[PDB]
């Protein structure tokens, strides 16, 4: 009926690290090849969370662009093509300049 | 050097389900317990992603509120206290209005 999440278990996942984030696919962010693509959103490892001391930003150190297979709904002929998004590798807590 | 992601693996994590999402701790969401809460953000299971059809929205079926141990920076005496947040259990795709 009830569970108390330990503070250690709280901050471990809260710290600035690479994590799975849903990214909505738009005509502005990744362009137009068809009217709409399926799925209309994807998941990539991004730098999320928060630093212990206020005054330190959560920013990526290294990043690599990954390519994913996406279903492109085109009217001449619908095809399963390829797309690309920028994915983060590792993050660090740097002081906010 | 790089590698491709299979479309099955693309949509599986992209489909509407419960997933780990970072939530920034704000005074608008949780009131005065400290000037700064540590960590300043936490992680809860939330309904993210997108449904296959355009007229289908991603909404939670049922939710259970979980409580987490949080360090409250109080200048009279700093204490490791307790706070609560709403967390989803399962999600579904419904037609829109």
């Amino acid at each position, epitope marked *: 009926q009830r569970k108390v999440v*330990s*503070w*250690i*278990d709280v*901050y471990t996942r809260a*710290t*600035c*690290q690479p994590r799975e984030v849903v990214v909505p696919l738009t005509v502005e962010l990744m362009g137009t090849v068809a009217k709409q693509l399926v799925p209309s959103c994807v998941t990539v490892q991004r730098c999320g969370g928060c*630093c*212990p*001391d206020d005054g*330190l930003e959560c920013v990526p*150190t290294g990043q690599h662009q990954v390519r994913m297979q996406i279903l492109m709904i085109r009217y001449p002929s619908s095809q399963l093509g390829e797309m690309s998004l920028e994915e983060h590798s*590792q*993050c*660090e*807590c*740097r*002081p906010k300049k | 050097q790089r590698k491709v992601v299979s479309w099955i693996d693309v949509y599986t994590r992209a489909t509407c389900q419960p997933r780990e999402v970072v939530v920034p701790l704000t005074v608008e969401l949780m009131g005065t317990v400290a000037k700064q809460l*540590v960590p300043s953000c936490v992680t809860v299971q939330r309904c993210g992603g997108c449904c296959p059809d355009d007229g289908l929205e991603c909404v939670p079926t049922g939710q259970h509120q979980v409580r987490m*141990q949080i*360090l409250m*920076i109080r200048y009279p*005496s*700093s*204490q*490791l206290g307790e706070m609560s947040l709403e967390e989803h259990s399962q999600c579904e795709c419904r037609p829109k209005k």
Partner: antibody
Amino acid sequence: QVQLQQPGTELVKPGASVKLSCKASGYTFTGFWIHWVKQRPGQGLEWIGHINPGNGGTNYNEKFKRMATLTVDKSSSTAYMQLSSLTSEDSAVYYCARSYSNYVRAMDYWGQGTSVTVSS
Amino acid sequence: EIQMTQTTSSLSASLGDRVTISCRASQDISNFLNWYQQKPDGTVKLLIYYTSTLHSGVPSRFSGSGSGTDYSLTISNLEQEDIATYFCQQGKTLPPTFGGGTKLEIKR
């Protein structure tokens, strides 16, 4: 999967200095304080100093006032301890552990240790 | 430096006994105490890190108690796991001060 690495054995001569290693692997290194603790054979734990690899802010114990120097490396993810001018009294096992916040001071994960022997 | 004091060091008890290890501080640390477990091979792990809050992978036998100047680590059921020296460390202010490691032998 989260752990700290310390070379178990370390040999030096009286007068010499050691650069002890604390290789961190399994977590975001620059988000946790790295503490260093001294322990004599069958004695209590003595806090030497802690270092924040995130900003570079350091703190040393008063009695180790000139004798520990703490450094960090963002590449390779390793924390260091520079024990300047060693004597026979400094022959002890040195640990490295990590805590999270400024207020709690709770080091959750420790290293295996570094048994520093000095004799020549 | 706050002189964190452990009155007892030599301790021996039979299996399945309520074993209590206490600590006394020089001043009020406001519930900021952490109990550590140093195994015979020198490996140190964190058992209870507040008043009574458990670290990941620690049996419910270890119970944390004490509110102010007086705190105690209480093992509800003693086994053969639980052969180690137990330290308490204050977290009120720097430095972080450790007490005298109480050796826990088991009676047979």
